[PDB]
Design a protein around this ligand. Structure first.
Ligand SMILES: [La+3]
Length: 64
């Protein structure tokens, strides 16, 4: 649960783009208000793939 209960909550609430995945553009867009900065860094290191997004599946996969 705590694995990403909240992170997911907010995230799921964040994903406004229109897909369900937590992408940078979409992130910085919505996070632009939050800590897009600190988030940008964390997100940048989060992706650790190339330039994708954080999907519920990937979000739970990373927690697992
Ligand atoms: La989205």
């Amino acid at each position: 649960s705590d694995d990403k209960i909240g992170l997911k909550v907010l995230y799921k609430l964040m994903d406004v783009d229109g897909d369900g995945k937590l992408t940078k553009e979409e992130v910085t867009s919505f996070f632009k208000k939050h800590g897009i900065e600190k988030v940008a860094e964390q997100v940048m290191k989060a992706d650790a793939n190339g330039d994708g997004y954080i999907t519920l599946e990937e979000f739970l996969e990373f927690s697992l």
